[PDB]
Design a binder for these strands. Sequence first.
DNA 1: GCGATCACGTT
DNA 2: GTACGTGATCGCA
Length: 580
Amino acid sequence: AKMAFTLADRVTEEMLADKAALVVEVVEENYHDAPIVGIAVVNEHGRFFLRPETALADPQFVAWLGDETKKKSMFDSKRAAVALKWKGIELCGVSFDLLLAAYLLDPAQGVDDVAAAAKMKQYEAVRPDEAVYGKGAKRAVPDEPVLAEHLVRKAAAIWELERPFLDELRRNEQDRLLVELEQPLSSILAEMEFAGVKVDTKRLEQMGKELAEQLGTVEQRIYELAGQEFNINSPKQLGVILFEKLQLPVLKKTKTGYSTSADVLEKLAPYHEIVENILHYRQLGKLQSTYIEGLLKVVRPDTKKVHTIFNQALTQTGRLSSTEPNLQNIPIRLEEGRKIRQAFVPSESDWLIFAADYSQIELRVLAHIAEDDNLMEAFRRDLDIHTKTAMDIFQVSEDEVTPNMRRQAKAVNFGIVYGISDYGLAQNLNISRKEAAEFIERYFESFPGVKRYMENIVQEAKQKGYVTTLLHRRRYLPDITSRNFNVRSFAERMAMNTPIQGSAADIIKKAMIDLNARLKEERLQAHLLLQVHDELILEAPKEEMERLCRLVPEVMEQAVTLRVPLKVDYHYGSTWYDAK
DNA sequence: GCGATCACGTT
DNA sequence: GTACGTGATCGCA
Ligand SMILES: OC[C@H]1O[C@@](CO)(O[C@H]2O[C@H](CO)[C@@H](O)[C@H](O)[C@H]2O)[C@@H](O)[C@@H]1O
Ligand SMILES: OC[C@H]1O[C@@](CO)(O[C@H]2O[C@H](CO)[C@@H](O)[C@H](O)[C@H]2O)[C@@H](O)[C@@H]1O
Ligand SMILES: [Mg+2]
């Protein structure tokens, strides 16, 4: 049964009450400089639909939008805030974001529209966005009558769902998590996205030349060594050449054919010279397709900046994700790829890039949560944790630790955080399963606190049905009770890892909020550009570097107080690559 | 035009 | 063994 609402041709005073559910619709997935197709307002006086041209040109409405005392309840306020920033309009007073509330209540639901969130509370008087707009090539904004009813219904759902969601958040002790952490972070992320990062396109185009050239050489070398030409980018075609024509040994299978992953190829290299060339081709081709051509496709031609979109309500652990482009996976490990970062430059003349990253935050959080005496003392002495672990598991003094012993202790440390598995560690170190189990057993002997935590957290997950982080974020793990060994085992690793990865996420999010408050108090022009899970990237005038060198690390180190210190390394330079 | 696979980049 | 996003190929319209 249709929903009553006024299709306003002009903005009236009752539309500007100090409390309302607000819908500022942006249909385009990427909301940067995107159109706002309609507006809906629901308050004590009724339900309204306003045409964007009308509303956004009305002085009273714009003032209402920017008045922090006029509270708004929305779904994905960041989308609206950024679309409005591009139109030179400021959105303030958003006191409740249904998307973030739904996300905190249960990240697993994958709530991506008002309808999905509403379903959580048995409210179904609203259609999924996809049913209204369609998807793919058939996506499109419907006629006004249909559009207006959909927006009003979403505003109505939001108006109705606010109390129920806040009630459950409070019961879960997650009310401060939404109000003091996620919602304020949303506004910071919006400023970061809108600001964007400047890209030196000329530098990228030149790198693309060099790559395309040497890639052509390796491509030919590969055909010579194979005795014919084929699509190297085709796992199927490549498998034929390697495991059939060249008779290379099949050490690993995928499921539709042979595995040609770098992990396997590394082992096959000694058998034929084609393997190394294929690996090199794989490296170059990745940089060319994903980072050179890929970036160049999303740089704004007018400003030469890339404007990422941080998905704040997607990961099951509380970490942010980044898209179009994904700026949280720009090469750093290998030098050839690392040079891609020379393309990310300050947006203004005489400004520099400043980056600060937490050193081993996940292992430090683990030491804190597990209260492992050995591990806490190690960080208190600021020891090389990998060398210390090698010393303990292999029972030797520091001087007796060989590089290979450190490499393996390091691999054990990463496994411990991800949810240690004798099978997973074995694959990682290319060793026996029994040998891996022995390393793990030795580790727990040295860190009884970590062992106790791993055992206790799994039982707690089974008892309560979920695990939590420092700031009360939670992740339900129903598979923890499954009778299928594999399904259950994965759930157990999640129980071990989520509190760690999750608490590290909580901490850096808090540091971001604290940092922005400090920057404003000090009236610095410095501002956040990106966040890559455990690090923060900013840009600022060169004259602000010395101050940032003290301010940024301190804010990040003081975000939360743990049983062990939090350590922050920092660097700055003319490009992201130089901020090393 | 789409979606399941494959691969590989980050933490 | 965590947690992600993107690109090339290929089976099917
Ligand atoms: O606006 C980001 C916010 O929107 C959701 C809602 O579905 O995702 C949409 O927008 C993202 C950014 O363009 C896309 O990656 C995604 O595919 C699209 O559905 C939320 O998941 C997200 O938090
Ligand atoms: O019990 C020994 C040891 O086994 C683990 C393996 O992850 O858990 C198994 O045994 C528990 C009983 O103590 C069950 O609750 C759990 O479901 C089963 O997988 C460890 O957690 C535990 O320390
Ligand atoms: Mg680091």
